[PDB]
Amino acid sequence: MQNKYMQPIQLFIVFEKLNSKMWISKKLNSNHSIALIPSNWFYSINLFLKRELLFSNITLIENSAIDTISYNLETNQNDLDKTNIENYFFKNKMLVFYNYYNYFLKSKLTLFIILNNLNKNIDSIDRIFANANWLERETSEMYGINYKWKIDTRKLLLDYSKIENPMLKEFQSEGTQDAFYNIFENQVVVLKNETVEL
Amino acid sequence: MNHYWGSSNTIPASSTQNNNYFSGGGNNVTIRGNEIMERLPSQTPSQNMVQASMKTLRFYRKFCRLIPFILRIHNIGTKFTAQQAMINFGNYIRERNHYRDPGLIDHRIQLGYELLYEAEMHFSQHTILMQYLSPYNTPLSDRGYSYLEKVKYGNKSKFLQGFYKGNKPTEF
Amino acid sequence: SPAPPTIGQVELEPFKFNHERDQLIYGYTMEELYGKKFG
Amino acid sequence: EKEKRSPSNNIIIDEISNSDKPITKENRESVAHHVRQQFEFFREVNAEEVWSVSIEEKYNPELYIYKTYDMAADDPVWRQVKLDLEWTFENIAERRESLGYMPTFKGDPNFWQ
Amino acid sequence: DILEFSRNFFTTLNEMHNVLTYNKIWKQRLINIGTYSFQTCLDYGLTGVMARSCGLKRDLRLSKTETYANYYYLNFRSYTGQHGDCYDRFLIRMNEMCESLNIVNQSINKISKFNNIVSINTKKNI
Amino acid sequence: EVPIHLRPYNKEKYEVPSTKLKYSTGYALLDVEPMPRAKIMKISYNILHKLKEIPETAMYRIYTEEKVKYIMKLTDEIEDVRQLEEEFGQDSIELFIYSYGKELELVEYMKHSKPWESRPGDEEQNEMIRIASQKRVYLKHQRVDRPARQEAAFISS
Amino acid sequence: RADMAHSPFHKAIHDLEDKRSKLFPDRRRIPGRKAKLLLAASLL
Amino acid sequence: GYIQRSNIHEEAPNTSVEAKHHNKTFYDPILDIDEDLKDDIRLYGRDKPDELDFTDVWESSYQNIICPEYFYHFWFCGIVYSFEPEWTINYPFEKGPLSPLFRGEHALRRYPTGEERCIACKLCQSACPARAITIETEPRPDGSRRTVRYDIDMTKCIYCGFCQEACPVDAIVEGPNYEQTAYLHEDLFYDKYKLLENGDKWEPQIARNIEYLINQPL
Amino acid sequence: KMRDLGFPMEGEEEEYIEQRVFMREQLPPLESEFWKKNYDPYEQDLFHF
Ligand SMILES: CCCCCCCCCCCCCCCCCC(=O)OC[C@H](COP(=O)([O-])OCC(O)COP(=O)([O-])OC[C@@H](COC(=O)CCCCCCCCCCCCCCCCC)OC(=O)CCCCCCCCCCCCCCCCC)OC(=O)CCCCCCCCCCCCCCCCC
Ligand code: SF4
Numbered sequence A: 001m002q003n004k005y006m007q008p009i010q011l012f013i014v015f016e017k018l019n020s021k022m023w024i025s026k027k028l029n030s031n032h033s034i035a036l037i038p039s040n041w042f043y044s045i046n047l048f049l050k051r052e053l054l055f056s057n058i059t060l061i062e063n064s065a066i067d068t069i070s071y072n073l074e075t076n077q078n079d080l081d082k083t084n085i086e087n088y089f090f091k092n093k094m095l096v097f098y099n100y101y102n103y104f105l106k107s108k109l110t111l112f113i114i115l116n117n118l119n120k121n122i123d124s125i126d127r128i129f130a131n132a133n134w135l136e137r138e139t140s141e142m143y144g145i146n147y148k149w150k151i152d153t154r155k156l157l158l159d160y161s162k163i164e165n166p167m168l169k170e171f172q173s174e175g176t177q178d179a180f181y182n183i184f185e186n187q188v189v190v191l192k193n194e195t196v197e198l
Numbered sequence B: 001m002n003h004y005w006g007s008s009n010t011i012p013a014s015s016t017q018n019n020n021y022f023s024g025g026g027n028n029v030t031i032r033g034n035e036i037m038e039r040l041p042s043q044t045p046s047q048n049m050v051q052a053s054m055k056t057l058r059f060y061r062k063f064c065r066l067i068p069f070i071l072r073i074h075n076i077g078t079k080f081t082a083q084q085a086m087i088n089f090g091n092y093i094r095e096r097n098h099y100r101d102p103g104l105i106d107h108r109i110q111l112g113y114e115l116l117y118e119a120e121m122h123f124s125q126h127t128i129l130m131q132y133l134s135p136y137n138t139p140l141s142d143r144g145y146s147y148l149e150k151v152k153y154g155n156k157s158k159f160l161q162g163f164y165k166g167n168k169p170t171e172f
Numbered sequence C: 001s002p003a004p005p006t007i008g009q010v011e012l013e014p015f016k017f018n019h020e021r022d023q024l025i026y027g028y029t030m031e032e033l034y035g036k037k038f039g
Numbered sequence D: 001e002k003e004k005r006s007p008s009n010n011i012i013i014d015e016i017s018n019s020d021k022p023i024t025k026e027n028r029e030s031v032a033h034h035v036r037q038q039f040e041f042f043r044e045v046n047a048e049e050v051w052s053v054s055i056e057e058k059y060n061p062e063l064y065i066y067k068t069y070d071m072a073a074d075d076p077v078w079r080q081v082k083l084d085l086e087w088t089f090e091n092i093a094e095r096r097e098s099l100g101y102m103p104t105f106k107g108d109p110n111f112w113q
Numbered sequence E: 001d002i003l004e005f006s007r008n009f010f011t012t013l014n015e016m017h018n019v020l021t022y023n024k025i026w027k028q029r030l031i032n033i034g035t036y037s038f039q040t041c042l043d044y045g046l047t048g049v050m051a052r053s054c055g056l057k058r059d060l061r062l063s064k065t066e067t068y069a070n071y072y073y074l075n076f077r078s079y080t081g082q083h084g085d086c087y088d089r090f091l092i093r094m095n096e097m098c099e100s101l102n103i104v105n106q107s108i109n110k111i112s113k114f115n116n117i118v119s120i121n122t123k124k125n126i
Numbered sequence F: 001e002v003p004i005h006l007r008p009y010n011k012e013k014y015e016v017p018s019t020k021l022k023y024s025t026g027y028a029l030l031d032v033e034p035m036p037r038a039k040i041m042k043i044s045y046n047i048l049h050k051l052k053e054i055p056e057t058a059m060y061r062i063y064t065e066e067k068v069k070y071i072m073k074l075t076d077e078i079e080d081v082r083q084l085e086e087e088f089g090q091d092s093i094e095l096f097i098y099s100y101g102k103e104l105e106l107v108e109y110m111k112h113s114k115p116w117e118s119r120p121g122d123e124e125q126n127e128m129i130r131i132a133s134q135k136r137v138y139l140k141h142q143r144v145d146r147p148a149r150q151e152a153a154f155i156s157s
Numbered sequence G: 001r002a003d004m005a006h007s008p009f010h011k012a013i014h015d016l017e018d019k020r021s022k023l024f025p026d027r028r029r030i031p032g033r034k035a036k037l038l039l040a041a042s043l044l
Numbered sequence H: 001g002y003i004q005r006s007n008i009h010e011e012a013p014n015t016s017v018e019a020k021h022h023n024k025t026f027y028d029p030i031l032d033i034d035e036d037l038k039d040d041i042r043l044y045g046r047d048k049p050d051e052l053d054f055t056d057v058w059e060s061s062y063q064n065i066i067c068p069e070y071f072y073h074f075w076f077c078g079i080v081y082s083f084e085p086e087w088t089i090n091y092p093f094e095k096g097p098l099s100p101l102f103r104g105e106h107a108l109r110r111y112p113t114g115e116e117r118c119i120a121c122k123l124c125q126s127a128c129p130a131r132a133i134t135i136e137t138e139p140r141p142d143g144s145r146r147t148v149r150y151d152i153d154m155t156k157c158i159y160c161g162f163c164q165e166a167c168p169v170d171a172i173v174e175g176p177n178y179e180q181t182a183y184l185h186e187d188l189f190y191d192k193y194k195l196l197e198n199g200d201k202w203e204p205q206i207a208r209n210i211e212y213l214i215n216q217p218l
Numbered sequence I: 001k002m003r004d005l006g007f008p009m010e011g012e013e014e015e016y017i018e019q020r021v022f023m024r025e026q027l028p029p030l031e032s033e034f035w036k037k038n039y040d041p042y043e044q045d046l047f048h049f
């Protein structure tokens, strides 16, 4: 950590009604900072990021989600401290995280948003960051997040005429149906799934 | 309107005209439009089950208006009549009619519109997409059905029918 | 308070065309402002 | 007395930087101080970079120009790379020739007794 | 053997360069096709060659806080273009291929014993 | 004597030809600005003028005004373009101008968003934060004592 | 530093005149020489 | 972890002639003619020079009137590159270079006495990323810990090598055989019979490679 | 109107048309547009008809 680093406190100085929860770790890069952002302010915060002076040169590197409902500390349970970020995973249905890179500040900024509503509603930002379109499409299809005000909600990387969210911990890697060829129908069909257990 | 369903997305009726010399019109409701769908914006949020139900009814109306074209292009008219397909999809919706979450309903409507567009544009295969249109308890109209099970187990409870049928291979 | 000087959408653009450059460099010359360009 | 911080202070905990100067709505000088700190960081972070940013590079551009059949010839460094590679090969060949032979590993079936 | 491959790789680079770089058809096919600004590079999260073709000068190997290997302590060069088109991207890829040879040479030299014991009487290697 | 942010825009002072400019910006399709100081001054004055729609007490307005004042003071102090670029990072002044020009559009976005007001979901967010900070223990490590003998009861009569 | 001249890391530095002359061109391209030659020759 | 630096700039190596490591031939006047072309706005952007010269006219005339592509490139490639020996390797009668680390077809080895080296520890089964190994073991009548069923699904297995790496007794080895083309999908369901037969057939070369691999650490 | 918007106005500038007509991104919607009470398509109020 022998570098010059400054917290991205501009967001919370401007959005004066929000509380700040920020982290930095040596597990990340020296210039990488994590923060907690509420969903109802996520869209406005991205609006501010996309056009603030020092945050103008910001690109949305990555976006995804975590099914925190089934998250459990498998080892060193007692070592957990109240300041750790893992404390926000427990009992929360979903956690959608975005990661941006800023060139002026040579920094990486990750924002975590907790989704507790059962339908997983959150405002999309693909209208602010263009590359977020396919990222949010993938996230919605794989985890079932209901993005709102999204440019294109059509599936991306999922099969035709199928509805599912495979990346949820409830889903099984083997799937629920297999595609074979039917001679009677003289074409590919899909039927129930029987697999091999090692 | 700059949308796939816009009134200007119709297929021209002629190389030099739209259906007439004194009028401009085209069909985009019962067939696919002229330009492909580049973006499908999310359904505007519904704050009420009333709005959610209206969305469901409008989606079902679009599906019913499109089913004959889907059947003709996919060559599945023999398997079921247009009305039979409409009723089967109605049963599909009825199984889901218990929903009471507007956000979940909006997500479901988005998925339904997407799959309907795939069926229009031949993205899906007829055998893969007919699972939604297939009858729940009636034989397919293009095949000869077997009533051996009904003859054997006439006037017998579903439990007894399942008991005789079995639910596991007997070899192992 | 004083009225801010008019700023057009063209000025905020990253690169300028000939007609856009002419308005900005009005009263001056390309060599005078941008300096001489060699090849 | 109980929470070990003044009510005006906005910092619940600052393990990241342990800053003793809170930024609050009441003290408008805090905003100016934070702005000065932000611009100081903006200058210094770019200054400490070795390759990412260089005003000298901005004002004295150095270009690579394709002007000959051999793209290595257009760069003095790549010519030296070629020469160093050939020099290494010649040195290895000279050493091996002077030695006059090469030891090698020979399989022995008795190793599997 | 890697050093020998590096020496011979210049020949393949030149063979491709002679038929592609200066060809009028190749220049007319690539130049001014796919042109984009830094803002596109920034908006769509373009990175690597696509980003450097805009002149963003963004390389993660030569970053103070983001270097991950011996790169930060090797003296090599990264290349960027003032035109964000396919021709600039092709030139950048060729130059990066050429510079990988220099990086490999430096890396191999970092593990080489160039010097040797010199006899006091004869001033020759032992 | 008058503050720079209150003085009217001075065209003569800033809009003057500048030598020793960069031959190129280094970025594709990013032309060289001939009057970076004039552009910064115009942008700063326009931003200050448009900030009057936001409430005075707004922290967004306070932050933007302080930043604009700092930038204007530095630009006025430093006439040399190279020195100004060295102060503003070490990149082309044109990129800084382009980034700074976006605040003009950001003003209306922030006015409509109203970051200085509270949305209904803030209470839910606070509840989530509060519950996330509770102490947690595991049943496996909780002591359980052997219960005493259950007293047998008999129905009277 | 290898990217700059006279670096200690360079090894092939002594008596490279003949090798460099063989390996690299000893001629410079005049801009319009080929154009003038070919056009005049074609006309005549 | 990190380190502290005081001088960010890496100064250029000494240019003095007397100093050692001086290269008198690093710069070539004929080749290093960059400075002439460096000041050209066309290189830096879309703009054009203030004063165009007849050199551009001559260059454009040469490029357009006499299209040099069909001659320059035709010669340089067709006539010259055709003079190089072919790079082809005659596969039926010659084989490409391999290494003792090559992972080809799985096989099961034996001790020189003829006893199986495989003890049913299932380390290979657990490490198999693709779940391609199935092992069932029962005590042998003599009492040895030996497997009763050892199957490798060659169609499901990625030839990573994790099986031989995790094997503690070098029982399962991915020998060099790669010409294992099968016409029936069932022929790729390798069984213990198939693996032991492969080991018996390929023991010489496998042992030869293992000798060198074991001796390398020494 | 095109010159006011900033389109190319010269032949040599016609080759950078995409940078002025299509490349520029569209301003994202104001967040107030997500709070409308109703989103039904507008139709003329047929009261008095
Ligand atoms: C019957 C059997 C037949 C068998 C055939 C077998 C196959 C044969 C294939 C032959 C192919 C052609 C040869 C290719 C060689 C390639 C060499 C190369 O790589 O360099 C390219 C070279 C240019 O590249 P470069 O030099 O590397 O460029 C870098 C320079 O630094 C850049 O410097 P710069 O740009 O400043 O100038 C460089 C310039 C040099 O420029 C100058 O120096 C010009 C200076 C003058 C400028 C103009 C001012 C006016 C000058 C004249 C003034 C006169 C009046 C003076 C009055 C004074 C009054 C006081 O270089 C040139 O010469 C370029 C001109 C290109 C000419 C194209 C030649 C086409 C040949 C086609 C042959 C077809 C054969 C068909 C088969 C046979 C017939 C059926 O171009 C050539 O020189 C082309 C070859 C020219 C001819 C030489 C050979 C002649 C003999 C051929 C014999 C063929 C065999 C069979 C003969 C018959 C036997 C019976
Ligand atoms: S090669 Fe890898 S995947 Fe195949 S059987 Fe061996 S360990 Fe399993």
Ligand code: SF4
Pocket: H117, H118, H119, H120, H121, H122, H123, H124, H125, H135, H166, H167, H168, H169, H170, H171, H172
């Ligand atoms: S092959 Fe090796 S790792 Fe696998 S069960 Fe046998 S002894 Fe164990």
